[PDB]
Design a binder for this molecule. Structure first.
Ligand SMILES: Nc1nc2c(ncn2[C@@H]2O[C@H](COP(=O)(O)OP(=O)(O)OP(=O)(O)O)[C@@H](O)[C@H]2O)c(=O)[nH]1
Ligand SMILES: Nc1nc2c(ncn2[C@@H]2O[C@H](COP(=O)(O)OP(=O)(O)OP(=O)(O)O)[C@@H](O)[C@H]2O)c(=O)[nH]1
Ligand SMILES: Nc1nc2c(ncn2[C@@H]2O[C@H](COP(=O)(O)OP(=O)(O)O)[C@@H](O)[C@H]2O)c(=O)[nH]1
Ligand SMILES: Nc1nc2c(ncn2[C@@H]2O[C@H](COP(=O)(O)OP(=O)(O)O)[C@@H](O)[C@H]2O)c(=O)[nH]1
Ligand SMILES: [Mg+2]
Ligand SMILES: [Mg+2]
Lengths: 428, 426, 426, 428
């Protein structure tokens, strides 16, 4: 019943920092590993120290060093903290090939070591970003190997969705297009969120006009914990990760369920307001709490999964579902009946001490696969096209051995993906 | 004379957790295993569900099956998880994930051999089996997937024993698995012809009852599965305990099945009302019959007055007159003659037990076989077709080797049950 | 009426350390040597294994043999090492090193003369010997090598006494000596025709049982050799103590050997389950028979249902009905008729003792002679051939003078036992 | 039940220094010999002083003087400390012949004296190095005599394997080739380790980038103690030295089992990590812990022996074996079934106070005979050849009476040895 977390790149690792901090908060784990009390994620020592079963990869020493100098440096095993010396430079060509390919063997052997520590490997999940060099480059490299060795294990990916308006990486389209090509075909499911959309959540629901990544990742951590800690904890409907895959992936392509999370409420907003299960789920179908800037009303739904924490009575859930099925404007694709996975944990929602979110007594996470995602690809299509037509920055990949045909090909694979969304949109 | 019960899937395991609790309540058996009752009858027919182990320990004759230790552990952790012996916990490691193919066709198939071996060990422990009962969900991977596989092998080993099962039927509103109708379709394809009878439980209907008549605003599955166990326990106790009428499960099966293929049941239960009204209720046979006939007290999301009634069983617990029961059943037949099928004269049959359920003066279990059942099949079949055309999640299933033509035949078979209900709906 | 036991090799010495412990437990004999029991029977038949020395001291009728003082010393250092007299410690100096040639053919041969002299002294101390028993490993230097040599001489001196031995058979997975199959091959060549019967113990199987049914996660060899001693002690106590059936070792040998050359046994033991389940177990004759028949409760890594059963002995300890035993054995014969050999009508034989093993109400020892045994021989023979062709470590053996043609004949002889099992497998 | 250690050359003696220090650590032996408490190695005096049954030979006073001035100078009997005045000069021609042959008679008589002190001589072992003058020269001279007098006793040799990259002795190939010729034929088994490989162990498992020989020999001492102290101490499976020979030497040639040792872990690496028997043995089949730079995956296995210390349950061992037999890529030669010797001592693993290795609760030593050793010979073949073709340095041997034919011959003997490995590699 075990799983592995993999943190690649800054985004992967810094999100991971929040994630493991939250898992410590879930059980009262001390920075040194001492836990007085979740062995699905952790491995126990004779001292009662538990080791989070995870791998941290950075090709630049700095971020891992940040871990190594922080409080959780005692928690993590030195072998889990893997670092190279040089970067990918925002570039798949080095991340996947030239540079990252050198260290990956080590990385894999640490993974395999942990796989041998697992007794019942259920699977794993990889945290990264769609635009970066290691964030997406190295990441796909890893998938190429992991899908061989662990072909039957859960291969869930979580990635930051490139913001349409702000991006620090000029060749991000190129990176992301190459990842599509290689991840679609290897991964089982990839989830993503938009930091821009999140900012809007922070300013509207948390009332914060100063979000940093350390805020943004707390919110992400919430979502992740709902599906990682609480799915291993007790509930009414205990849903596994393999079950998630078995209930969220409808086609052999990928699919890309997007996250939505409600409650996201400031402490003051929690006052004077009573949420019910149904009210929280109402919020879950509002564009306003959509974690990716993509309009839910534009597309049609294919999948939807609702996962519940704390004070949730199935009775209320059932009523809530009835209304979301019938009251809303949620259009859905023919193919699908509304079999929405309901996970119901008794495990209460948790809050980070010193965080922004209010203590809540119940909480709902929503995953959804909508046809509007093709518009996200359309965004990438043109951004890629523009650059590629001019061949701007192309020498930074070509010099590492990339082929122009390959890039065209990858775009075409994306186009095919868009076409399949088109297909799904056609009802039948 | 004895029964073996097998639970499977998270649903089945949690239902059984309440079922066995109740059975031990009925007999005064402590959560730790020993008998601390106080009635002669409590031990007298205990054999049907318990083996007395040395030390006056009673072992529930059942196997708990899953593919995830954690669910099993949670069962074991409560009272009455200690009464089960470790040998009745048969489980693997890595889920099924609510995948029929894994459950039935491939991986879960692997476990079934160890399950069956224990089954055999228990079949030997019994003097004479009456039958077997299984608890599971129709749209689940181990519930239906693996469970079905097991059933086909048990039936093979014991053609002469009763094979029935109670199963959670996908409610119109709450499906969890996207291909829940697919799993259900496949289970019909396999189960219907490999079972003597199956019961149709709808959680949605159950949630309506709990608020509709019981006026409750907090139930959980344990509270709804209590209601489920009330019907299950209702059936077998009579068989166990002294009564007036005819208290044999097989005879029940005989009276309720007019045709080899149409053996689906709609359970209902009386009395079943909130405490407030309990001060305003009268306890008579007509009172129970009013609650029994009323469709809202059915646990299946069907409507018997929409379809036609083929067979009705009315089981009574507690002291009642024969006259009153006879007359009220007749009255029911008379007044609802428009729903009954004309081919069966006096289509309402009774069974009477003189032992009331603990805490009540009287109670009744409604078992029906209507044509209305076909509506559930129709809903599933339709949903199935849509998914079938798209192959939603079928790469998971075909990836594990499940062939689409097998599914095609499954679809037909669903449609066949509907057409046969139409053939006898007239 | 009496038995002499000789232990050899590190294995044999450590097994015997537990064996004798148990025997003294059975009779209430203190680790220091005196009798402090409390039952008439405890002293009554003590003669078979003990000499009472002046002062009410009991001397175990056994010889401890090794070629390294340190192992002997470690035995002597524990409780019950004090009960053995110094004269029963016969050892040399410099190992054998797990070398048959040294053990049998050359160096160990030198010691054997002193061992035998003590044997003779004990044979005189007995009134009337029933037989001898030896404990050893088949792939070991002193265990098998020197031990075999001794056996050939004892048999020569006493053709009319029972010569049996229990031996550790190289498990498929854990061989220690690279030429362990070589030593084993040579021991077959010598032992089979120089013994009345030999028992096949597989440590791997034992490790499976200890975790499989006993659910233990810490055993050592002392815990596994406890299980070994349970079977050994099971056999001889009946002979010692009052029972119902036929309690003579020779008669056991007669009933279990249909053919002069096929005398290999598969020991098994019941009851043999973890404490958790002990609260959920019932103690009946069928319960013991279920554990006895089940191949997983065999101590030999064989599978009796793969081969055919030639002979079965069921030894029971404690109060049981004759009827029940008879019927359950019959049932076994009936239900497993596909494994039994048709030439022997009623191939399952019984023996019954009324004394239970200390702490249990009842127990049973399974002794079988199947054809399945040949599979072990096949594994060894094959491994042997490969080594034979390469002469692995044979310079050590040929260096001590062991000739390859002798080994060639040994190989044939292994193959002969297999062919004879095939000849009666049919 | 007694044995003799022989320390020839600096390498032999300095390793011995660590070895006897460890034996003192094993029982609490004071520098003066006072032991308050292993008489298989030691001889007792009426004062309760015990003398390590060993001979120290150096043809240059200095190293023995180092012993004579250290703390253990009180431990060793002055007659055990044998020294000449002049060296072999890296040269077999003087070590075996011209110089060492003069003192050897004394040396032998001290050995014989100790042999007479032994009551049950089980055997002995010789510590040296394959390249040096006394390290290999004198060493083989000794074997020539010891194999006569003690023909039936254990003749185990331990030698430093010449590092392929660093060697301080230009005629080391020549020395080692001559030793092959003379040791193969006389000795029973020779073990060897590569200081370069060890450096890699020190830097990767101990995390030390500054190893000196005094570190390197501690690690060697660990391995040796597992097979010397703990094989005389109590266990489940008490394995003798003669048993080792009887379980490790498959052919009458020599054979050369190589050492591997796992656990080799720094204190910090021990934290947060729980080793099992199986996990330690997994490490034992990793190239990474191979004490000789020779790739385990290249060759095929012929022999393998695993020796266990401390908290080892045969139950776990059995499971571990099952997986190494079936899970690994360990190819093995037909001839051999997998009868791997398992020695299981209850005697716990010991650690040198102020050392680098972490306190462990269990430990496993592995000996193995792989066909990859022929590549080691190939290395020597060419190094020898190059020198010999030019006849570089040849006058330093010729002037002492060496023959050129002899050198050719010795090479040919090595070639024959390689051919026999070839033979074994051919499965049959
Ligand atoms: N939510 C979130 N997004 C982040 C975080 N850090 C970076 N990102 C986003 O991820 C992308 C940045 O990737 P980089 O940090 O440039 O690169 P990398 O993927 O770590 O790998 P390299 O390019 O080789 O350094 C941008 O789109 C950022 O907006 C973080 O902590 N949280
Ligand atoms: N592990 C280890 N290797 C050593 C040690 N001392 C030397 N060596 C190695 O052994 C070889 C050195 O042998 P030398 O010290 O030159 O010579 P010797 O064998 O003592 O004999 P002479 O040549 O006559 O002085 C080199 O390959 C060294 O790397 C030591 O303390 N430990
Ligand atoms: N009444 C009832 N239904 C349940 C329970 N658990 C899951 N279910 C129903 O079972 C279906 C899901 O199948 P599940 O039991 O998870 O399948 P499995 O565990 O993979 O065999 C849904 O329709 C749920 O409403 C329960 O404890 N009681
Ligand atoms: N059951 C069991 N087997 C043992 C014991 N000791 C060694 N063995 C087995 O005996 C074989 C080794 O032979 P060994 O007894 O060392 O030979 P010897 O001591 O030279 O005669 C291996 O297969 C071990 O598993 C023991 O105490 N109990
Ligand atoms: Mg970076
Ligand atoms: Mg020197």
């Amino acid at each position: 019943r075990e799983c592995i977390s993999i943190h690649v790149g800054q985004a992967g690792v810094q999100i991971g920092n929040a994630c493991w901090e939250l898992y410590c908060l879930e059980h009262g784990i001390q920075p040194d590993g001492q836990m007085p009390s979740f062995n699905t994620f952790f491995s126990e020592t004779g001292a009662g120290k538990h080791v989070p079963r995870a791998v941290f990869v950075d090709l630049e020493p700095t971020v891992i060093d940040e871990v190594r100098t922080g409080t959780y440096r005692q928690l993590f095993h030195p072998e889990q903290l893997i670092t190279g010396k040089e970067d990918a430079a925002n570039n798949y060509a080095r991340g996947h090939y030239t540079i990252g390919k050198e260290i990956i063997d080590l990385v894999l052997d640490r993974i395999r070591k942990l796989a041998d520590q697992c007794t019942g490997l259920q699977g794993f999940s990889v945290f990264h970003s769609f635009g970066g060099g290691t964030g997406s480059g190295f990441t796909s490299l890893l998938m190429e190997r992991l899908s061989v060795d662990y072909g039957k294990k859960s291969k869930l990916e979580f990635s930051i969705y490139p913001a349409p308006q702000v991006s620090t990486a000029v060749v991000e389209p190129y990176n992301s297009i190459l990842t599509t090509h290689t991840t679609l075909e290897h991964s089982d499911c990839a989830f993503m969120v938009d930091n821009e959309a999140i900012y809007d959540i922070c300013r509207r629901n948390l009332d914060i006009e100063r979000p940093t990544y350390t805020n943004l990742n707390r919110l992400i951590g919430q979502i992740v914990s709902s599906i990682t800690a609480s799915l291993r904890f007790d509930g009414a409907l205990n849903v596994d990760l393999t079950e998630f895959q078995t209930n969220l992936v409808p086609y052999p392509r990928g699919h890309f369920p997007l996250a939505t999370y409600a409650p996201v409420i400031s402490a003051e907003k929690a006052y004077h307001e009573q949420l019910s299960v149904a009210e929280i789920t109402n919020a879950c179908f509002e564009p306003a709490n959509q974690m990716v800037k993509c309009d839910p009303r534009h597309g049609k739904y294919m999948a939807c999964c609702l996962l519940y924490r704390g004070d949730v009575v199935p009775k209320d859930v059932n009523a809530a579902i009835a209304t979301i099925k019938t009251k809303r404007t949620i259009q859905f694709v023919d193919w699908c009946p509304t079999g929405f996975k309901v996970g119901i944990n008794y495990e209460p929602p948790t809050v980070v001490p010193g965080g922004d979110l209010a203590k809540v007594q119940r909480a709902v996470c929503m995953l959804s696969n909508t046809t509007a995602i093709a518009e996200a690809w359309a965004r990438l299509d043109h951004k890629f096209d523009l650059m590629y037509a001019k061949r701007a920055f192309v020498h930074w990949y070509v010099g590492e051995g990339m082929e122009e045909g390959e890039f065209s090909e990858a775009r075409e694979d994306m186009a095919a993906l868009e076409k399949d969304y088109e297909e799904v949109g056609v009802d039948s | 004379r004895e029964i073996v019960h097998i639970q499977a899937g998270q649903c089945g395991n949690q239902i059984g957790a309440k079922f066995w609790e109740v059975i031990s309540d009925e007999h005064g058996i402590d959560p730790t295993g020993s008998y601390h009752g106080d009635s002669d009858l409590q031990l007298e027919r205990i054999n049907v569900y318990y083996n007395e182990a040395a030390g006056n320990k009673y072992v529930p004759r059942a196997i708990l099956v899953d593919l995830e230790p954690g669910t099993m552990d949670s069962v074991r952790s409560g009272p009455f998880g200690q009464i089960f012996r470790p040998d009745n916990f048969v489980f693997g490691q890595s889920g099924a994930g609510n995948n029929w193919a894994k459950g039935h066709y491939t991986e879960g198939a692997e476990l079934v051999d160890s399950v069956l071996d224990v089954v055999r060990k228990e079949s030997e422990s019994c003097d004479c089996l009456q039958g077997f009962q299984l608890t599971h969900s129709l749209g689940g991977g181990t519930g239906s997937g693996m469970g079905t596989l097991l059933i086909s092998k048990i039936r093979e080993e014991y053609p002469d024993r009763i094979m029935n099962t109670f199963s959670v039927v996908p409610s119109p509103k709450v499906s969890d698995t996207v291909v829940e109708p697919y799993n259900a379709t496949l289970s019909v394809h396999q189960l219907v012809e490999n079972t003597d009878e199956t019961y149709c439980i709808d959680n949605e209907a159950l949630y309506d009852i709990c608020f509709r008549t019981l006026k409750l605003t907090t139930p959980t599955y344990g509270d709804l599965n209590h209601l489920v166990s009330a019907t299950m326990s209702g059936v077998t106790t009579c068989l166990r305990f002294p009564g007036q009428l005819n208290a044999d499960l097989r005879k029940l099966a005989v009276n309720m099945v007019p045709f080899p293929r149409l053996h689906f049941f709609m359970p209902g239960f009386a009395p079943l009302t909130s405490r407030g009204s309990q001060q305003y209720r009268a306890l008579t046979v007509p009172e129970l019959t009013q609650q029994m006939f009323d469709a809202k007290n059915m646990m299946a999301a069907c409507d018997p007055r929409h379809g036609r009634y083929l067979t009705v069983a009315a089981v009574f617990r507690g002291r009642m007159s024969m006259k009153e029961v006879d007359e009220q059943m007749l009255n029911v037949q008379n007044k609802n003659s428009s729903y009954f099928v004309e081919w069966i004269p006096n289509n309402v049959k009774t069974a009477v037990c003189d032992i009331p359920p603990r805490g009540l003066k009287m109670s009744a279990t409604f078992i029906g076989n209507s044509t209305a059942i076909q509506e559930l099949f129709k809903r599933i079949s339709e949903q199935f077709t849509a998914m079938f055309r798209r192959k939603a999640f079928l790469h998971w299933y075909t990836g594990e080797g499940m062939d689409e033509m097998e599914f095609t035949e499954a679809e037909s078979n669903m449609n066949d049950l509907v057409s046969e209900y139409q053939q006898y709906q007239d």
